[PDB]
Amino acid sequence: SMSVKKPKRDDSKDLALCSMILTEMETHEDAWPFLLPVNLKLVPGYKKVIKKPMDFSTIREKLSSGQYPNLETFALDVRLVFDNCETFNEDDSDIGRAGHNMRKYFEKKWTDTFK
Numbered sequence: 001s002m003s004v005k006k007p008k009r010d011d012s013k014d015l016a017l018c019s020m021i022l023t024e025m026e027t028h029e030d031a032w033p034f035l036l037p038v039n040l041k042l043v044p045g046y047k048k049v050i051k052k053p054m055d056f057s058t059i060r061e062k063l064s065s066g067q068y069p070n071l072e073t074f075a076l077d078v079r080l081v082f083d084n085c086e087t088f089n090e091d092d093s094d095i096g097r098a099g100h101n102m103r104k105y106f107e108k109k110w111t112d113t114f115k
Contacts, residue, residue: 014071014114018063021109025078026056028105030098034081050088054080071114078106 025031037055040047059077061067068074085099 011071015063017113018068018071018074021106021113022056022060022063022078024109025102025106026060028102030101031056033085033095033098034102046088050084052080052084054084056081075110079103082106 026035034056036057038046038050038053040053046053054077059074059081062077063074068077082099082103085095089096089099091097091100
């Protein structure tokens with residue numbers, strides 16, 4: 001509260017570490033459905049159904065331009081990618097399986113790096 005602060009958790013490396021995680025996700029073989037924004041002109045249903053589209057290229061631009069205030073807003077956008085994937089894709093599809101695999105991959109890097 002006013003003039004009463006919990007000790008300072010060191011966040012000075014968070015930008016570099018989020019950038020390394022994102023590089024690892026960009027280079028995973030199963031990242032292909034997630035590298036670029038879904039083409040809203042060419043994929044029926046996507047625009048209406050998926051209220052907040054998100055992809056790795058968009059996260060990379062946001063990260064590079066100071067548009068994440070902290071590491072939790074970064075993780076929210078990464079999870080949004082996989083939450084969107086589950087909304088639109090059957091679990092038993094190549095894309096559906098890719099999204100489960102990538103979410104698993106992310107969450108381990110997240111825990112190992114920050115927790």
